[PDB]
């Protein structure tokens, strides 16, 4: 009886592949070959934050593109003012093994989580200003890998087990649960329209979810190894995935297949962080070989290298206005990079 | 306006206070030693923790030295992702039940995978070959996992290094040293890294594990410091 189910499933996968192949009438490189190259991108560091004393996993820019939070394995969550390098806040975490952090769009709350399977939300604005645990959300089985504030009262998280959860911070239990992945979900990203979000797991596939009704809308299986970072295009109709293949790939929801591949022969290490610029033309990818690369998204050609980190680049972020690019690494340093005219 | 100066000096005061707090925390952070207690499934991890929610942390002080021990309780069997978080720990205490399926082979594969990790190549491993008394009984009764599973045990002899264990059957010593030799051959394979292996036939609930772990951590720290001074 099961063999019939397997045959039906493989027939459906074959027909989906055939539909995708028939949909492919051209190639992104073929159409973009007549576009002026971006050219060499000389980015230099402007600020260096030297407060953390342990390797750093996560960071998130503020809505004002000035305040940024950072999470380090000594159980520390530091909120910096990037303009003046001053430390606005320093929060000691109960669990020293942090793997993700988020900064609320309103700026009043900060998310944190890790191997304790508990998402801690900290209230920055209190009657005295002292930071305290606003609420702990529990219920995930695997390690909390990523978390993003959907709203001041809603937060979406991904766990070590194959499960994402949209919570209600007011009441503290999962409002919706998204399941269907095969491996550990490593990264998360929220679409600009706030209606959808993509999740990349360790099964070499990325799934698109809608927070309203809560089931997978599309699945992309272009990669061939664990996916470590995902991020929507600023348009909201595409996203990029970084994997252990030493390859970054671009997917489109409407096309529902590959668009462009960002592989290079000299690159052997995997990708740990992927982010876009404000216009989306530049794709900044953090690599394990102590460096960071800038790719022309429409040409798949390297445009610059953000060298200067003494360890692997674990986290990368781009400001909302696209004024500077922050990169954190395991050498307990955050470097902010900018271009010069 | 005078305001800009007011918030600027307030920011300076807050930054200096936070810097003082960070230095105070840095002292404690550098004082404590972090250890990751992994294991080969059932190997006696719970009994060892009792003798000495995601992750469990145990704080114990020996000889005025503080040790935090982290055990991954509520985690999935796929370790290829969250194990990278423990690259900078002082040591990984790997407990192996030397006594269903071939547990020894799975433990050997896990140890080889940990040893050959690109992020864990600088992290030392302390081997706890537990259940030595259980292994003794197995060998004495005839139950074998050393010859039955590994046909090279017939063409094996007890190494002439040492035998600190007191009066015991030569077969039991040969078996335990064969297992230790398999682990050591896995560890000392050709490669690179600043890590070292510390095998131990513990099977001890008399707080001897405290002394063993403390001595191993002392050795690891001394070797790292000497390597900083390129004395070896």
């Amino acid at each position, epitope marked *: 009886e099961l063999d019939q189910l397997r045959q039906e499933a493989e027939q459906l996968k074959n027909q989906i592949r055939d539909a995708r192949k028939a949909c492919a009438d051209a190639t992104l490189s073929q159409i973009t070959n007549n576009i002026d190259p971006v050219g060499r991108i000389q980015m230099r560091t402007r600020r260096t934050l030297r407060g953390h004393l342990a390797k750093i996993y996560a960071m998130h820019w503020g809505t004002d593109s000035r305040l940024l939070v950072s999470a380090s394995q000594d159980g520390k969550l530091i909120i910096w003012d990037s303009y003046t390098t001053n430390k606005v806040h320093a929060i000691p975490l109960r669990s020293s093994w942090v793997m993700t952090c988020a900064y609320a769009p309103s700026g009043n709350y900060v998310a944190c989580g890790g191997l304790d399977n508990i998402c801690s939300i900290y209230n920055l604005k209190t009657r005295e200003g002292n930071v305290r645990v606003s609420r702990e959300l529990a219920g995930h089985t695997g390690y909390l890998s990523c978390c993003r504030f959907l709203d001041d009262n809603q937060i979406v998280t991904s766990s070590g087990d194959t499960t994402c959860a949209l919570w209600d911070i007011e009441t503290g239990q999962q409002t919706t649960t998204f399941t269907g992945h*095969t*491996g550990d979900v490593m990264s998360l990203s929220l679409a600009p329209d706030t209606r959808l979000f993509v999740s990349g797991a360790c*099964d070499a*596939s990325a799934k698109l979810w809608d927070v309203r009704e809560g089931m997978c809308r599309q699945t992309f299986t272009g990669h061939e*190894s664990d996916i470590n970072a995902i991020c929507f295009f600023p348009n909201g109709n595409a996203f990029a995935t970084g994997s252990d293949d030493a390859t970054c790939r671009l997917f489109d929801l409407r096309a529902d297949q590959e668009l462009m591949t960002y592989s290079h022969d000299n690159i052997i290490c995997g990708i740990t962080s992927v982010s876009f610029s404000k216009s989306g033309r530049l794709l900044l990818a953090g690599y394990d070989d102590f460096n960071c690369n800038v790719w022309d998204a429409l040409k798949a050609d390297r445009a610059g290298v953000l060298a200067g980190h003494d360890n692997r680049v674990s986290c990368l972020g781009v400001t909302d206005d696209g004024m500077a690019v922050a990169t954190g690494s395991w050498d307990s340093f955050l470097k902010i990079w900018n271009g010069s005219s | 306006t005078e305001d800009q100066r007011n918030e600027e000096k307030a920011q300076r005061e807050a930054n200096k206070k936070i810097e003082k707090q960070l230095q105070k925390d840095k002292q404690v952070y550098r004082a404590t030693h972090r250890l990751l207690l992994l294991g080969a499934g059932e190997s006696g991890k719970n009994t060892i923790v009792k003798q000495m929610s995601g992750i469990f942390e145990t704080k114990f002080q020996v000889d005025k030295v503080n040790f935090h021990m982290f055990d991954v309780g509520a985690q999935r069997d*796929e370790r*290829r992702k969250w194990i990278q978080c423990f690259n900078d720990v002082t040591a990984i205490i790997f407990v192996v039940a030397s006594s269903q399926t071939n547990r020894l082979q799975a433990a050997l594969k896990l140890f*080889d995978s940990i040893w*050959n990790n690109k992020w864990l190549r600088d992290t030392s491993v302390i081997l706890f070959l537990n259940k030595q008394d259980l292994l003794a009984e197995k060998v004495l009764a005839g139950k074998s996992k050393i010859e039955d599973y590994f046909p090279e045990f017939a063409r094996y002899t007890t190494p002439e290094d040492a035998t600190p264990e007191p009066g015991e059957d030569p077969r039991v010593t040969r078996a335990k040293y064969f297992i230790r030799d398999e682990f050591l051959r896995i560890s000392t394979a050709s490669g690179d890294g600043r890590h070292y292996c510390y095998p131990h036939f513990t099977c001890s609930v008399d707080t001897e594990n405290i002394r063993r772990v403390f001595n191993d951590c002392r050795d690891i720290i001394q070797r790292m410091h000497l390597r900083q001074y390129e004395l070896l």
Partner: nanobody
Amino acid sequence: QVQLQESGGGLVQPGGSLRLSCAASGFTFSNYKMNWVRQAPGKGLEWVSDISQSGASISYTGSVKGRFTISRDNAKNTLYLQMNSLKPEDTAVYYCARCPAPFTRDCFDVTSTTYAYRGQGTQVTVS
């Protein structure tokens, strides 16, 4: 997308010879270390053999060494496992697995309950 599909097996008498063929059509075969694992009808997953990217490094779980031979062919992007002199304890399901990281001497979660990069099943029985 990896699509690790293997074949072979069946009902054989003890002391027979079987040849399991495994094919991958979702990645570059030569870049990954390959292996075979075995799941008994009443037991859990158990790694049985492994071969490196080029074939220089080959290792076995024991009690099957000399009896089992593993060999990959990069031109056909396939792999073969030749087993001889079957005992009435090898009746189980054999999985042709590729562990995740390429160009790496390490790979951790081949023998996991819910591995993603493991192929389908193939029953072989001896009696």
